[PDB]
Subunit: 213 residues, 3 copies
């Protein structure tokens, strides 16, 4: 993409696991991030599913510079602009639309949109994208689906998400067409509530180490 | 929606079950509709899958005022115009296209379009819709798929249809994102052939009661 | 389709099996085509997944006129125009986009695009298409998924592809909505490299024999 300094590819190749984060209380944003980074996980997807979403992104950006902070659940050109202004380094969407693809390519940060079918993948490719989110992974047909897609689209790379856990993330990471996976298991809800950042670091650490094959 | 008198939500929240009707003989339309209303089910989806489908919608619209009649299997603006002229109160489609979304938006009746993927859902949302049909429910991945597909979209409401039986509709109705389900067991062909309307009313009553709690 | 001299339907009703061909060495193209024809299979889908793909179509068109050669993995207008110019008698794509559909309808040869959802099916139907590819068939939910997707659309026919084999192709061919299936087992990569055309003719004859329903 002509206007992307940080390629989508670089974002997805930074690490094997990208935590899909849902921060309910702003205060938990930074400690959670530092907790994750401490465990070896740097690419953080802060989903726009809470009121403090945009503020948690800005906070993590200022206080945790090493973290590669981005926004998740970006659904339209305005949310994209909003997170871009708030310092998001990348944007991830559950699916794609033309208005979103357009505003993205014209923007400055990389967009890694989710797709479920090859028709959706083709729409994305028509806009020149090469990296995609495969969501929801299991529902879409999981590993087998990705293996089928690699036939007509050998150059395309994915980040499967949805139904991925330490019990199966290795099945996906093994595919050549898979660069990394998304998961929400790294940050247990109860964990933030209890201020158990220690646990979060162990999960992150275990995620990366278990990703070595 | 700006142009819709009746909200798509009102249609979906009128009752727990919306019958997906296939009536081949026009002479069975009205009594079948009254039988349904007698069982407590007043939102009737007559599918455009038979020759008399539209005439059936018109008859029910005129003769059964205690029922909210609409069209099913509406595939394009042409059919949307036809069912609207016929008196349909709402329109349901197996999936969606922009031409259909545009005609419905500018139209006067609510359209509850089906979707299988988040990109299809997002396209619908780009047109202002917030209520969708999840079809074919079972093939899309069932409750788990809907729980994932609905996850990043907290405000969206669905009406799952396809493979839904009395044996599993409670599993869907139990979902926070589900307002009602669509089922074709309330109007069995065999029962419609022998004019067994008492059986149809019972099926409606059981559907309504079996959905409680 | 007004602009297609040869209908999409005729392409799919030619035989029960359409080989999805991946040829890496141009010199193998002609003998391969002759071997398949000799086995009773003549609708050859040369996929655009190799550098010599287009020349292969040109050569087959030239040296094996009795075969109905076409292109697969056609992703956009440019490729559609390129294979059309090279002599392709039909085009197949993994999925569909509006630009590809518009260009195909304006063009001179039939496009049989893949779809996975009813919304994608409806988009294709908006452009007047009635024949589609169902890909990736198995990963999409197989026979059950196709039967559900086909439920509300009685006029459309399919060519399931993706994970189809002698073990299950009859399960698909048995469906009223299925005209034929696409498979790559008739031309194993090792057979091509070894120039083992007797084997290819055998697989073809066996494919045809085992499909009789």
């Amino acid at each position: 993409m002509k206007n992307w300094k940080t390629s989508a590819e670089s974002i997805l190749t930074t690490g094997p696991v990208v935590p899909v984060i849902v921060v309910k209380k702003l205060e938990h944003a930074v400690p959670m991030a530092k907790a994750l980074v401490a465990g070896g996980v740097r690419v953080l997807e802060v989903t726009l599913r809470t009121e403090c979403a945009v503020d948690a992104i800005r906070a993590i950006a200022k206080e945790v510079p090493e973290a590669i902070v981005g926004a998740g659940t970006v659904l339209n050109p305005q949310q994209l602009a909003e997170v871009t202004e708030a310092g998001a380094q990348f944007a991830i969407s559950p699916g794609l639309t033309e208005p979103l693809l357009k505003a993205a390519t014209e923007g400055t940060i990389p967009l890694i949109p989710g797709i479920s079918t090859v028709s959706e993948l083709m729409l994305g490719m028509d806009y020149g994208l090469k990296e995609f989110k495969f969501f929801p992974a299991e529902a879409n047909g999981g590993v087998k689906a990705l293996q089928a897609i690699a036939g007509p689209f050998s150059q395309v790379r994915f980040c499967p998400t949805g139904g991925i856990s330490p019990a199966n993330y290795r099945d996906y990471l093994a595919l050549k067409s898979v660069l990394c996976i998304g998961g929400s298991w790294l940050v247990p809800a109860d964990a933030l509530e209890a201020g158990d950042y220690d646990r979060i670091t162990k999960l992150a650490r275990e995620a990366v180490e278990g990703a070595k094959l």
